[PDB]
Amino acid sequence: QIDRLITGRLQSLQTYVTQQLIRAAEIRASANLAATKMSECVLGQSKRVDFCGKGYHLMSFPQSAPHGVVFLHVTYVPAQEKNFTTAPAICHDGKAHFP
Amino acid sequence: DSTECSNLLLQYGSFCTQLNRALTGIAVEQDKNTQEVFAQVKQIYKTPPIKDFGGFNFSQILPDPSKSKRSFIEDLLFNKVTFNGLTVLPPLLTDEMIAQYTSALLAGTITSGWTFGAGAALQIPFAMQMAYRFNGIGVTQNVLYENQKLIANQFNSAIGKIQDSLSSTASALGKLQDVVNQNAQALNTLVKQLSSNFGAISSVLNDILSRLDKVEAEVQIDRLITGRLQSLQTYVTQQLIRAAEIRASANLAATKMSECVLGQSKRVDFCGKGYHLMSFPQSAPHGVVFLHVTYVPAQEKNFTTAPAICHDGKAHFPREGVFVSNGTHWFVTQRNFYEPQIITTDNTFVSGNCDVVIGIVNNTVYDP
Amino acid sequence: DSTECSNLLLQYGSFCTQLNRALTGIAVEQDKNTQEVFAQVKQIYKTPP
Amino acid sequence: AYTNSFTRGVYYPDKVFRSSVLHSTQDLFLPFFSNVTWFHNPVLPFNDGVYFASTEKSNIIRGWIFGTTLDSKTQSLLIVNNATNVVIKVCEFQFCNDPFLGVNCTFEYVSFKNLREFVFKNIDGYFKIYSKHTPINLVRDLPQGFSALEPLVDLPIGINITRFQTLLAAYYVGYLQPRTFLLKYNENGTITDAVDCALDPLSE
Amino acid sequence: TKCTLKSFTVEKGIYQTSNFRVQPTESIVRFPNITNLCPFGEVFNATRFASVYAWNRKRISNCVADYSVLYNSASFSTFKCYGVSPTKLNDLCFTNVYADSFVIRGDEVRQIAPGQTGNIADYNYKLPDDFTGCVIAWNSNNLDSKVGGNYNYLYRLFRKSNLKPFERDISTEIYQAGSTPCNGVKGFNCYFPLQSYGFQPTYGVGYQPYRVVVLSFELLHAPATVCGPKKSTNLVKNKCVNFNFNGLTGTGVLTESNKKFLPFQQFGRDIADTTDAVRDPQTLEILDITPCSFGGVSVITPGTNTSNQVAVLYQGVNCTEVNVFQTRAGCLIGAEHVNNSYECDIPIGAGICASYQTSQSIIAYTMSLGAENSVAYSNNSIAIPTNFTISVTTEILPVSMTKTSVDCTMYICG
Numbered sequence A: 001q002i003d004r005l006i007t008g009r010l011q012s013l014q015t016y017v018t019q020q021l022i023r024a025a026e027i028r029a030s031a032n033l034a035a036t037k038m039s040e041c042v043l044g045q046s047k048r049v050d051f052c053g054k055g056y057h058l059m060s061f062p063q064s065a066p067h068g069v070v071f072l073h074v075t076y077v078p079a080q081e082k083n084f085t086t087a088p089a090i091c092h093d094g095k096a097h098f099p
Numbered sequence B: 001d002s003t004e005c006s007n008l009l010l011q012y013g014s015f016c017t018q019l020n021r022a023l024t025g026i027a028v029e030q031d032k033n034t035q036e037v038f039a040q041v042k043q044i045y046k047t048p049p050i051k052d053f054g055g056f057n058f059s060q061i062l063p064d065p066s067k068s069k070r071s072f073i074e075d076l077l078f079n080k081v082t083f084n085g086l087t088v089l090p091p092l093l094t095d096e097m098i099a100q101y102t103s104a105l106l107a108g109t110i111t112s113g114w115t116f117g118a119g120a121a122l123q124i125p126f127a128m129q130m131a132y133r134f135n136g137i138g139v140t141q142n143v144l145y146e147n148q149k150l151i152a153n154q155f156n157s158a159i160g161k162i163q164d165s166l167s168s169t170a171s172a173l174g175k176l177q178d179v180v181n182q183n184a185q186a187l188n189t190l191v192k193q194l195s196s197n198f199g200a201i202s203s204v205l206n207d208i209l210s211r212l213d214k215v216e217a218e219v220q221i222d223r224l225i226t227g228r229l230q231s232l233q234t235y236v237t238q239q240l241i242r243a244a245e246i247r248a249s250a251n252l253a254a255t256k257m258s259e260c261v262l263g264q265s266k267r268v269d270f271c272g273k274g275y276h277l278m279s280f281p282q283s284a285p286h287g288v289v290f291l292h293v294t295y296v297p298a299q300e301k302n303f304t305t306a307p308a309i310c311h312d313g314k315a316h317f318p319r320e321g322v323f324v325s326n327g328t329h330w331f332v333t334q335r336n337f338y339e340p341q342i343i344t345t346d347n348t349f350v351s352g353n354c355d356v357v358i359g360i361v362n363n364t365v366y367d368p
Numbered sequence C: 001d002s003t004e005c006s007n008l009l010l011q012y013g014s015f016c017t018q019l020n021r022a023l024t025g026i027a028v029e030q031d032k033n034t035q036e037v038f039a040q041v042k043q044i045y046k047t048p049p
Numbered sequence D: 001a002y003t004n005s006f007t008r009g010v011y012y013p014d015k016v017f018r019s020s021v022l023h024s025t026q027d028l029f030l031p032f033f034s035n036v037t038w039f040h041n042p043v044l045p046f047n048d049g050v051y052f053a054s055t056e057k058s059n060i061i062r063g064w065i066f067g068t069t070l071d072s073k074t075q076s077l078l079i080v081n082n083a084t085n086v087v088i089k090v091c092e093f094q095f096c097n098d099p100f101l102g103v104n105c106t107f108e109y110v111s112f113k114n115l116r117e118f119v120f121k122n123i124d125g126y127f128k129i130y131s132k133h134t135p136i137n138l139v140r141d142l143p144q145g146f147s148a149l150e151p152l153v154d155l156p157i158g159i160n161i162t163r164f165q166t167l168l169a170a171y172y173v174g175y176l177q178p179r180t181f182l183l184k185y186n187e188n189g190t191i192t193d194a195v196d197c198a199l200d201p202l203s204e
Numbered sequence E: 001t002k003c004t005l006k007s008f009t010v011e012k013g014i015y016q017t018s019n020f021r022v023q024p025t026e027s028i029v030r031f032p033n034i035t036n037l038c039p040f041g042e043v044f045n046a047t048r049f050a051s052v053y054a055w056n057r058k059r060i061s062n063c064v065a066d067y068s069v070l071y072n073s074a075s076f077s078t079f080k081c082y083g084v085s086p087t088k089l090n091d092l093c094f095t096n097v098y099a100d101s102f103v104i105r106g107d108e109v110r111q112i113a114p115g116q117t118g119n120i121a122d123y124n125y126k127l128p129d130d131f132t133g134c135v136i137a138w139n140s141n142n143l144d145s146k147v148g149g150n151y152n153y154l155y156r157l158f159r160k161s162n163l164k165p166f167e168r169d170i171s172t173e174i175y176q177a178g179s180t181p182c183n184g185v186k187g188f189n190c191y192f193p194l195q196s197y198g199f200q201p202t203y204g205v206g207y208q209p210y211r212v213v214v215l216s217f218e219l220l221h222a223p224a225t226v227c228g229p230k231k232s233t234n235l236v237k238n239k240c241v242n243f244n245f246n247g248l249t250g251t252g253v254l255t256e257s258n259k260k261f262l263p264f265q266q267f268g269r270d271i272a273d274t275t276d277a278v279r280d281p282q283t284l285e286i287l288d289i290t291p292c293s294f295g296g297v298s299v300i301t302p303g304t305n306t307s308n309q310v311a312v313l314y315q316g317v318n319c320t321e322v323n324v325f326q327t328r329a330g331c332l333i334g335a336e337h338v339n340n341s342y343e344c345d346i347p348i349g350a351g352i353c354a355s356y357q358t359s360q361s362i363i364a365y366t367m368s369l370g371a372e373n374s375v376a377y378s379n380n381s382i383a384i385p386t387n388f389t390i391s392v393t394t395e396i397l398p399v400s401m402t403k404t405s406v407d408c409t410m411y412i413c414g
């Protein structure tokens, strides 16, 4: 009878440790991303689109949270556009000018 | 659905619940993976009725109203990839909804450049958007406007080669087909393991219950329960490992959406080989296809070069270019395309006297 | 290397084949991993004398 | 005398329909490209089972006997292709060596241009018989090609067999070995090809 | 849902709480046409039997033993059984079956039982003391008696020693019973070992002859050549049923099929060896099998800290099997279908979502992907932003789990 309890309790514990190994691999991928967000968003100014939140990135600030991190990403968003006619070049004394 | 076996299976406790919680997390993740790649666009942008894109021809990658409403290339991609308590579940986004996202991403990209990812979509003429993407690789924008027919052709031809490759090949799309194959093989292995005895008298549950009286039949069924529960734990553990690989691949695809489609990446080899110009999303079964457009420098010539030049004892350095000589005369060019300017006081800047610089040369600087 | 044991192991079905298939997938991926890192260059460039 | 078997002696191993599929199974089969003894009526070993074949339309070949002593001391199985239909009986037989053309009992049952092929085996007291018929271009040896043999009878006779003999103008014999074969079932559930897995490394 | 989550409060969501499964509406049994009935009638209506000293045995093999004619054969003056009940015999199978047959007076039929004694049990037919089988008799005065006495029926009066169980001995040498020598001739203690009942038609009921047959049964390593009748049901297409075709037990829906089995094949298997078609053994048509309809049942709810309405989704089930609405994810019961589209609140599948909205109800809708927009494109027109907003976005990332350790010996063995 004890050998049936050992068999089932040992399988119960193997199932748990396997799912904790698979879950710790997911949390490591998230910690590697959070460490990269701190180097590139907080310690610098990222040119990578949507890496440090939507809009053009200005800076970001880390705040601690239990089991994690929070980034406050400060970004520049263009707000009030108007329409204009446009041209690729302008022609002066028979020569093409580019901006 | 044997009541004799079902009562013995209760003695194993939570295992049967916790396998379904595990597979539920896999199923819910697949919808999130698909959402994080394709749902990166705030509004369902649609293309103009006019097609004045400066000679570039997107008709192979844009929606076809006569078709789901997929593009021509998305139909090649959808054609080239091809029950014992087991159930499959539908995705949250239908293949038509995924095609509306690749449509909106593509219409936004063509009509408004990188601007629709950073805020409101701002219209810009496509040849002027491509001129800015040339500045983003360090090639001056006049190199596009002076070569626009030759860049519009050869883009159109390079897109035609995608259709011909996907029409003629039988292996190139195999990275999506292998994901289909592993999941079919996993369910066939799980079902074939119902035929196994695991050392029991038979693998058929009514056969056991016909041959043997209650106390011995209970001993034989507990072997099938042990082996079938080990068979199902083996499947769910392997799907948990296989789903972690697909999630890492979906996070890479979501990053290629943001940085290659919604932007212009300066990261080497991130958005295809060569200096990246832009890329286009196309949907495919269980995945995404990126058509990465890049600039490749192609017909090089050798030149003599110098790091600085002496004028009136002053050392001159180029502001943006590099100094080169054709053998007799000295010029400054932009660095990624040969275009020689005559050296002037506004092509260059001064820093100190000649004597410090290793390999300086003597040539006139014209002051305009 | 026992025939008496091998015929009892054969009552468990796909388990032995799918263990070998998993280790083969791991092994083929180690060559892939190494080629994705090092084989990034088209031609074997050489330095001058 | 010996001749090659080619890809012959495959039979439908079970009464299961399968369609447009490849199925892998282990059973007593004649190994591909093995050689077979050719004869022109000795007592022979039976081993695990026999593939027998002949070209016949005179019916000089007429039947078989199967057993251990074949005669008197214990029961044996008699089979005869009587021109009305096949006759089968199990008795403590004491009949002559073989009947020929002028060129207690415990069970009973009643049913050249063509190659005729038969497979006989005994498993757990059931005697299994399979057969097929085909025209042939060249009488000297078994023809290079494929054709699956279909079950005739599944007799509950229980009696032991280790030797057999023909009752009877030339015929082939080869022995079934425990082999794994991969069988191809087409859209109509006929077997149309096979791979003998232990033949060569391509077959593996 | 509260019981599934082990909680009195349930948060907003879709939760699987059950599996639906359509039940077998009845049981089917199908076997070959009931044929090759055993030759029991050849013994029970024979012209006459042997003398009891030389009892006559019929081998029964390779046939169906329907004993039910015997169960109803009220002309039997007895039908005893030992080791087994007569009514059970139609459920059974055996390797060999025997019927042992003789004539004796009614006052000696009572010697035919396990452990009995007297000249018939001692010297003619001995049953085992643990006998498994049946004893049958009927009065045969009008069949076996004759005027002046029928002397053609005999029994062994005496023997040197008693019979072993089923020992058969038909030798008729003079039995020397004592010290007086037999001398090859009839005399006192030099008995001819047989005597006769001399059956007269004027005999009384215990003196009269009875025809007797003893049934006996054995199951060996050799195959079960004798079995009871395979009584079979009607065949019930297009419903959920339990079925038994020959030995193939299962549960499912039986339908006509386009398949083309070969004449010897009885049933068919799918790519993963799961059965999917069968030949009916009474009318040789090919039937498809499909499973009884089944799937997860999920309960769709706003949080209980807002409302107690719910909707129920039967995943992959057609609504015929169970406001009510067929989604492509399965039938949805208790949610109002809407022609508008909104962003997804609770996800159902195949483009469908559900929400709780205002008088309030759970509603189901095709999900909105976003507002439709046409960018004002042309050659030679551009939009340039005249103002901006500084935006602060929040992003939240996990970094660590709770750290755990286990004394594996204390968890397993306490």
Ligand SMILES: *[C@@H]1O[C@H](CO)[C@@H](O[C@@H]2O[C@H](CO)[C@@H](O)[C@H](O)[C@H]2NC(C)=O)[C@H](O)[C@H]1NC(C)=O
Binding pocket: B051, B057, B059
């Ligand atoms: C955009 O490219 C497509 C190429 O598929 C052009 O349509 C084809 O044009 C050729 C001749 O150049 C015809 O033979 C084909 O029948 C056309 N149809 C298809 C489906 O290939 C299309 O005309 C181009 N659009 C513009 C505005 O130039």
Ligand SMILES: *[C@@H]1O[C@H](CO)[C@@H](O[C@@H]2O[C@H](CO)[C@@H](O)[C@H](O)[C@H]2NC(C)=O)[C@H](O)[C@H]1NC(C)=O
Binding pocket: B150, B153, B154, B299
């Ligand atoms: C730059 O390369 C292009 C090709 O990539 C050259 O254009 C080709 O010129 C030949 C001249 O006979 C034509 O036959 C081809 O049809 C042209 N191709 C295209 C796509 O238009 C171009 O001449 C090269 N320019 C320089 C300065 O070398």
Ligand SMILES: *[C@@H]1O[C@H](CO)[C@@H](O[C@@H]2O[C@H](CO)[C@@H](O)[C@H](O)[C@H]2NC(C)=O)[C@H](O)[C@H]1NC(C)=O
Binding pocket: B326, B327, B328, B329
């Ligand atoms: C180096 O480039 C210069 C300018 O392109 C070349 O000088 C010109 O040569 C042509 C005849 O080949 C004359 O018509 C021009 O008047 C010259 N211009 C100047 C500014 O001198 C020069 O020939 C080139 N040298 C070599 C070796 O190719």
Ligand SMILES: *[C@@H]1O[C@H](CO)[C@@H](O[C@@H]2O[C@H](CO)[C@@H](O)[C@H](O)[C@H]2NC(C)=O)[C@H](O)[C@H]1NC(C)=O
Binding pocket: B310, B361, B362
């Ligand atoms: C670049 O021009 C300067 C000035 O004309 C050259 O300097 C002369 O170098 C020679 C040899 O060392 C001396 O004899 C002169 O006295 C130097 N003159 C002055 C005013 O310094 C210089 O040699 C030239 N560089 C090269 C590489 O030819």
Ligand SMILES: *[C@@H]1O[C@H](CO)[C@@H](O[C@@H]2O[C@H](CO)[C@@H](O)[C@H](O)[C@H]2NC(C)=O)[C@H](O)[C@H]1NC(C)=O
Binding pocket: E033, E281, E282, E283, E284
């Ligand atoms: C099993 O027995 C049934 C009943 O006798 C057979 O079915 C009948 O077959 C005759 C053949 O002439 C038909 O005329 C009838 O219409 C059939 N049905 C009925 C209800 O009688 C059946 O053929 C037998 N099957 C086998 C395999 O022996």
Ligand SMILES: *[C@@H]1O[C@H](CO)[C@@H](O)[C@H](O)[C@H]1NC(C)=O
Binding pocket: A081, A082, A083, E376, E383
């Ligand atoms: C720009 O042009 C479009 C189409 O003419 C018009 O709808 C829009 O109101 C204009 N103004 C702005 C600010 O986009």
Ligand SMILES: *[C@@H]1O[C@H](CO)[C@@H](O)[C@H](O)[C@H]1NC(C)=O
Binding pocket: B300, B301, B302
């Ligand atoms: C000139 O350029 C070509 C092309 O890059 C190169 O192969 C060649 O070696 C160069 N010339 C010399 C003298 O090295």
Ligand SMILES: *[C@@H]1O[C@H](CO)[C@@H](O)[C@H](O)[C@H]1NC(C)=O
Binding pocket: B358, B359, B360
């Ligand atoms: C460059 O190398 C050559 C020898 O190959 C040498 O003559 C020359 O002086 C060197 N120039 C510089 C700037 O080092």
Ligand SMILES: *[C@@H]1O[C@H](CO)[C@@H](O)[C@H](O)[C@H]1NC(C)=O
Binding pocket: D002, D003, D004, D035
């Ligand atoms: C038949 O097969 C055996 C296999 O050992 C071989 O020795 C023999 O030579 C073969 N004979 C012929 C004629 O094929």
Ligand SMILES: *[C@@H]1O[C@H](CO)[C@@H](O)[C@H](O)[C@H]1NC(C)=O
Binding pocket: D082, D083, D084, D085, D087, D110
């Ligand atoms: C076989 O042949 C004999 C005559 O030789 C014939 O009487 C008999 O009926 C045939 N057998 C059967 C099963 O009919």
Ligand SMILES: *[C@@H]1O[C@H](CO)[C@@H](O)[C@H](O)[C@H]1NC(C)=O
Binding pocket: D074, D158, D159, D160
């Ligand atoms: C068959 O052979 C085995 C082993 O020799 C023996 O035990 C068994 O009794 C035999 N059966 C018959 C019917 O001869």
Ligand SMILES: *[C@@H]1O[C@H](CO)[C@@H](O)[C@H](O)[C@H]1NC(C)=O
Binding pocket: D186, D187, D188, E260
């Ligand atoms: C299968 O049978 C059908 C008729 O049922 C026939 O048309 C076909 O030629 C057969 N063979 C194959 C390979 O399908």
Ligand SMILES: *[C@@H]1O[C@H](CO)[C@@H](O)[C@H](O)[C@H]1NC(C)=O
Binding pocket: E041, E044, E045, E069, E073, E075
């Ligand atoms: C004898 O034959 C008749 C024929 O109708 C049958 O009914 C009966 O069951 C048979 N057996 C006995 C014991 O009468």
Ligand SMILES: *[C@@H]1O[C@H](CO)[C@@H](O)[C@H](O)[C@H]1NC(C)=O
Binding pocket: E305, E306
């Ligand atoms: C329950 O809902 C109320 C509003 O209906 C809210 O104020 C409260 O915080 C919620 N939670 C609990 C535990 O009451």
Ligand SMILES: *[C@@H]1O[C@H](CO)[C@@H](O)[C@H](O)[C@H]1NC(C)=O
Binding pocket: E318, E319, E320, E326
């Ligand atoms: C389900 O069953 C009904 C009636 O048989 C049918 O009309 C309906 O089309 C089926 N469901 C689907 C999703 O097709």
Ligand SMILES: *[C@@H]1O[C@H](CO)[C@@H](O)[C@H](O)[C@H]1NC(C)=O
Binding pocket: E339
């Ligand atoms: C929904 O729209 C369909 C036509 O698209 C119509 O038949 C149906 O009556 C509408 N239902 C409601 C609630 O308006």
